[PDB]
Amino acid sequence: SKYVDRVIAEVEKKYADEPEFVQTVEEVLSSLGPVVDAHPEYEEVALLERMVIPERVIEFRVPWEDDNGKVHVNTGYRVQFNGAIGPYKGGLRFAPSVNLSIMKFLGFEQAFKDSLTTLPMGGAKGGSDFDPNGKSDREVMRFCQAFMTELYRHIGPDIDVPAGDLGVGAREIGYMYGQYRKIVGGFYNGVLTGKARSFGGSLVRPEATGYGSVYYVEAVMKHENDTLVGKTVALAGFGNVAWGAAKKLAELGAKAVTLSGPDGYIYDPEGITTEEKINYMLEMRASGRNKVQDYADKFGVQFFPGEKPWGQKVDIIMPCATQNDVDLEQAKKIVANNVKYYIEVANMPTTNEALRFLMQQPNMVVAPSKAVNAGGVLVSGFEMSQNSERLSWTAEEVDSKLHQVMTDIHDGSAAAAERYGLGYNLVAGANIVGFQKIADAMMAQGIAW
Template sequence: MAKALLGPKEYIEKVIEDVKQKSSGEPEFIQAVEEVLPNLEPVLAMHPEYIRMNLLGRFVEPERQIMFKVSWMDDEGEVHVNRGYRVQFNGAIGPYKGGLRFQPSVNLSVMKFLGFEQTLKNSLSGLAIGGGKGGSDFDPRGRSDEEVMRFCQAFMTELYRHIGPDVDVPAGDIGVGAREIGYLFGYYRRIKGAFENGAFTGKGLQYGGSLIRPEATGFGVVYFCNEILKHENDTIEGKTIAASGFGNVTWGVCRKATEMGAKVVTLSGPDGYVYDADGVNTEEKFNYLVEMRNSGRDKVEDYADRFGAEFFPGEKPWGRKVDIIMPCATQNDIHLEHAKKIVDNGIKYVCEAANMPCTNEAVKYMQENKVIIGPSKAANAGGVSVSALEMAQNSMRLTWTLEEVDQKLHQIMSNIHKNAKDAAEAYGFGYNLVAGANIAGFDKVAKAMAAQGEY
């Protein structure tokens, strides 16, 4: 006799409980799963075969988790040992695709949460790429170029076995910029003995990189936010934006927001945040963000000293009264107490530029109080989208102009917003882009997994 199927709600609860048991020491991964799965209940009600196939149970388990030793020598001759990771989460719709993060906070939980989110994000992009993520607990800050190069070469000695243009295509992330990508790809080319530049994205323009790739995540968030404002019969022109961080994403947000007539008034770092009432909106200020990032000092106070902005040590910018909130730094930057300040200030829009920058409690509170949230898996998909465009250019051995890449990015972000909106409305969530992004991202992957077999 066939075993009776669980109902959609009970099945989701069972899968979440299984994740909690199997991944009990991985809070970020559990948080990501708990954020996504409840939104899928109406999808499972429409597709009971997904329950029979235990599709969710398969969806939340990475296809491959690779962890390896990275030993390298510093300039003083001391040997250090770090841990390297690559989580190839889901390859049902294309080769694994996702960045490498070099940061002391990197662990398996962070890698799995990022790979899980990346799977949905890449699906939303409409491009043929699966989800993955990798990195190391190595900290490049304060290290010489030679030390970073030695680490990258040691890291690639293992990673090269698991990547390739049609297998897994890494890119940069926190702590991995143009310098690191250059060292990583250079050693990959040396080991493989072939110019497989499609095995990496975020490369330099001289060896297969794409125009506007460094700015792409920030540009995409602003484009996505503008789609939200258009839906609300509003415009981004004249709006003030509170952003966090001062890295590539924030830099891209500042540039595109300025171009579209908005003004970023805050930046943040580990030491606190700055408020610039005039806005981060000149070429001198944009260039100084790059200088700050490359300095390795990791102090946003440097910006306040340079431009006479206000500096608030040890604080976050979420208490400022602005029009739009754009967290651009790292996960769980906005907690419930920050969400309450955002609501109290009457802020209507939160667009997530970082990965999972709001806790689940913060998201719930803001949504209950009519704040419109552009979820990270949709809003910050611009970076991976231009990475996929870089892969396409590499495959065709050609280079598109800046205008061509920017136009394609703008169209991708418009499509992501429309698909998330349509999915939310189709399944009874109204204009809830968090639910819509989860459903639309899952739908494509689920259909591909189902079509490819049950095991």
């Protein structure tokens, strides 16, 4: 589509200094050509040009004092990218690399991911260049208070609902929420999600991302007249997502056979499928040692230091740890191994070069992270519902809806790709399904945003 190409070119030029953002826009917009060409009305109201500029961006100063009385200064961000279909929604990331480029790219993708859930959630991202590494609990608390002392005026249960991400977990959400309720003088606990149960968090929260990713893979098997049962799976990490996936894979008849750490990776041909094995991951996580070897030492399984587990021959690859984990190098190994299922779980775990490549392979099934990991934000949506109803749902209620939605995200994507003649292209399908709802809403709302 000439219209699409034109917007990408203008973006590339205007936001040259924001490489991460430019690439994401290109990647998403480029898959929408067929849809946009079928809707000339979009161009007339400059829809794409509007979409690529966040509704509102806020940056602010965050001075705070350490345990020694020294004053530090960081910068806080919240990018409220698109609120056409629900209050802004998206996690908070505290990491020294954080800048506007990275917030806009994650925030643009968040809009598409949130649109897929089928719930009324807009897209946003925020965070700070504050580095939680090595800070005391008390230091993290004062930072969170000073961060919220400004942030509170831009968010709220019907406006913008943040949540956790890298560097931001239950603990930080708790401290921010305490400051919020104090300043505002009321409860409004739907202002943040990822909360502890005592003040409104949802059951299935910890399992959400991981289980969700397995329900999606299940819908993939079905599509392909195949089965999870018996399948082996390579994971990355030993964290939350990895824990949740391993757990549900095992329950489903499958088994994970690898985990990974900055120190290397393990191989466990038996499968991280026991209560004892599965639970230990929590331990290692706890431990704060940050080494995957511990599992190998504990269970007496292979530990290959300084190596990715992308070389092992398995049925399914699920990268659930960090960005740009799988590169060309690793993709080629995966290919060579004749792995059919490549399922992104963590955010942007694959480089593009790697992605196109995997995508050129005819026999392969490639699932994009914005769809596969939607389970967590989907449970954040259920948490906002529970908070608005002022009650809790049972675990069975939450898990059962989680399950039905993840299946629909898969099926919907396929149907959409197929409709625009793209085959079984889950990557473009996720983009298309996500874009359509947003477009419909923006077109109906007129030219205001």
